[PDB]
Design a protein around this ligand. Sequence first.
Ligand SMILES: [Cl-]
Ligand SMILES: [Cl-]
Ligand SMILES: [Cl-]
Ligand SMILES: [Cl-]
Ligand SMILES: [Cl-]
Ligand SMILES: [Cl-]
Lengths: 211, 207
Amino acid sequence: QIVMTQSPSSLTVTAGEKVTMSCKSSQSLLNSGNQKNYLTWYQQKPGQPPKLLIYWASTRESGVPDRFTGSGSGTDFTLTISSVQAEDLAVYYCQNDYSYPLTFGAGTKLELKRADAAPTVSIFPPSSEQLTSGGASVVCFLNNFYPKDINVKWKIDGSERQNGVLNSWTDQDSKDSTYSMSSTLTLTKDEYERHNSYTCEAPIVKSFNRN
Amino acid sequence: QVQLQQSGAELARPGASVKLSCKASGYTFTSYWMQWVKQRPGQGLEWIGAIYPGDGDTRYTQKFKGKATLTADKSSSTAYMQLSSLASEDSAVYYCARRWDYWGQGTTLTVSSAKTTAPSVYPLAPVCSVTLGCLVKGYFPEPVTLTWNSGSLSSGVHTFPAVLQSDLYTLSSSVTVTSSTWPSQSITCNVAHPASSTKVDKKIEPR
Ligand SMILES: [Cl-]
Ligand SMILES: [Cl-]
Ligand SMILES: [Cl-]
Ligand SMILES: [Cl-]
Ligand SMILES: [Cl-]
Ligand SMILES: [Cl-]
């Protein structure tokens, strides 16, 4: 079978920069009859199905921006993004379309570098409905920050709290290349009502008191 | 418009079998190969096989021989993929595609012995621009579909990936609008869970 090798596995660039990624095959993908290289490039943005970018190695699909260019022949192919935009954040796959089985490459993950950005923090006490059910979740949102490695810290009545905290980052944003994360402090209704002050912080601090 | 409508999300027990469907329209069903592709969470694309409905020709990659069986119904313009002897490794999203150009939205398959659990949805109003929240916890399996109103505020929406605690999934979403929008205009959190056939609307109201 035909082995497709993509390089690099991933790379990070700033918007406006040029990017070149490689796709190599173990056998030639050149059709002798029509002299076309049956190599296909796909773009897969986070949470979306794969989208066709280039087919026949160099033929661009309708709708696809001109900044995407495929080239190469036989066993060596390249995808070039002339001026990377924030929306270009995706994994790029090449596919052997020459002969079955139509193997994929392992993909090239394109990530974006941008300027440092502080999060906008918002904290939410348990809702009345959840309290009625017997549970109590304190939810904190830290949105639109960069880089990804942010430090979220919880405090209960002025003392640091770590137990019952679950964090969850979004993928990098397609429009501003920032990250967002939720931090949820989960405890029982009784455990929640044994305390007054609740603090969520990144320093950027948000807090509330049960009065 | 060429369209490929894949069947909905599926929960199946280990050892069982499922039949994923892909109904085609907008082109001649019998003149093109229908492609099937598997994608595990965080992993790359894996080619499963293909079928040519015009004459019934089929192709498979080695790993999916026996596991996958490709068929087609010309009278309904529908391609089928049967996944048999299901195991946890079969849990993935499966796509159908006509050649390279058109792709279905994908079908999420979860292989588990666990029962379906409907989520509890809670509105998250601010403390006593503005950011609102919606908490979706204690559901199985993935996925859930969360949307704010008619998807018009999606410009400032961050729906976070579900976390798995004690065999149940918990998800939250934030929406940020200007302070003149809420509570002047109504903002509702809409959550759908196919596996439990549950659809709940929670209106974000001041505390
Ligand atoms: Cl462009
Ligand atoms: Cl493959
Ligand atoms: Cl920037
Ligand atoms: Cl706040
Ligand atoms: Cl089943
Ligand atoms: Cl026909």
